[PDB]
Design a protein around this ligand. Structure first.
Ligand SMILES: [Cl-]
Length: 370
């Protein structure tokens, strides 16, 4: 490791200072020292700052300011390497943060939830820890709608830690769909985005939840009506793609009909707009694969898609060379993903109609099949 120098030790020592004012300023200086330095994070974790910080956040005498600043620093350490997250987990930070979530003060709750978000988002953290203690999910649900930060953080934690049907149903029984639906009308886009993500992963292959989503009412509008608005071009591209995913999944589960207006006039047209040359490579791959997921079961959708906004022409441009230098290198390295996506959509488009396969064969290269 990098040698530990007197500066780092002085930061950790100032926490043990006898004057409370000096301790508070020491934790503040510690937060300002780990902003960009992952090495400073590692040095302070090895010097034992995390146990002391947790103790200072546990004390009854500690002011709300000191508790908030200590939680902030603990989150800043969790923003570093995976080794740091493992060290913080080994110091039992999640239990302490869960006790901190019992606080009335909102800023302190936000700091603890920010730390929990970074931890649960990190790969080294097992998702089962979220469900190992049954009371944490109800407690998080209760805090879901106190601030935009609680909404965003708890949505991120849930969306990253759902993991499919079993504990997805655990989350559902605690009122996930009803409590998270209201966030889609929030004045904060960051919230509205994250809620969307929660729904997309929550309804991927769970027909039961999809049906529930069809009848959920948020601010006088049925939830699919909110999704359709989030397909509009004025909205950000992410918002659109994710909305389309939700609807396609709801359509695949049976909650929405393949002949429904939201699918043929909004969702599918939106997905072809994701396949344009102007779109990013990742967006083209996801739009194409999601459209293939949508159109695979129904022949009528396949035909409609084949005649929508020169889709088969745009797909041909997946095989053409790109036309910011790091993005260009990234697009030449990941071009295989784009070509593979094009073939997935071709396979779904031409599954039942030979004339569509003839159209694609002609589009992919010069020459007409016999
Ligand atoms: Cl942050």
């Amino acid at each position: 490791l990098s040698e530990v120098t007197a500066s780092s030790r002085h930061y950790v020592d100032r926490l043990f200072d006898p004057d409370p004012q000096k301790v508070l300023q020491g934790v503040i200086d510690m937060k300002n020292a780990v902003i960009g330095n992952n090495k400073q994070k590692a040095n302070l974790i090895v010097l034992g700052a995390v146990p002391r910080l947790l103790y200072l956040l546990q004390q009854e005498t500690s002011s709300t300011e000191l508790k908030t600043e200590c939680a902030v620093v603990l989150g800043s350490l969790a923003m570093g390497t995976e080794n740091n997250v493992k060290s913080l987990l080994d110091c039992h930070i999640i239990p302490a943060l869960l006790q901190g979530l019992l606080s009335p003060d909102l800023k302190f709750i936000e700091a603890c939830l920010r730390c929990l978000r970074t931890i649960f988002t990190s790969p080294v953290t097992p998702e089962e820890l979220l469900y190992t203690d049954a009371t944490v999910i109800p407690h998080l649900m209760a805090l879901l709608s106190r601030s935009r930060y609680t909404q965003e953080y708890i949505c991120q934690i849930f969306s990253h830690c759902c993991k499919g049907p079993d504990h997805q149903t655990i989350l559902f029984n605690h009122g996930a769909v009803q409590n998270i639906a209201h966030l889609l009308t929030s004045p904060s886009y960051k919230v509205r985005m994250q809620a969307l993500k929660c729904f997309s992963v929550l309804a991927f292959e769970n027909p039961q939840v999809s049906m529930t989503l069809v009848n959920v009412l948020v601010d006088g509008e049925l939830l699919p009506q909110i999704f359709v608005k989030m397909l509009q071009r004025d909205k950000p591209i992410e918002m659109q793609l994710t909305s389309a995913k939700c609807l396609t999944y709801m359509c695949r589960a049976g909650a929405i009909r393949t002949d429904d207006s939201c699918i043929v006039l909004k969702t599918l047209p939106c997905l072809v707009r994701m396949c344009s040359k102007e779109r990013l490579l990742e967006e083209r791959v996801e739009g194409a694969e999601t459209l293939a997921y949508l159109i695979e079961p129904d022949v009528e959708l396949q035909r409609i898609a084949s005649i929508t906004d020169h889709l088969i022409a745009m797909l041909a441009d997946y095989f053409k060379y790109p036309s910011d230098i790091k993005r260009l290198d990234h697009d030449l390295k990941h071009a295989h993903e784009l070509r593979q996506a094009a073939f997935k959509l071709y396979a779904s488009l031409g599954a039942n109609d030979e004339d569509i396969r003839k159209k694609i064969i002609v589009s992919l290269g010069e020459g007409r099949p016999p």
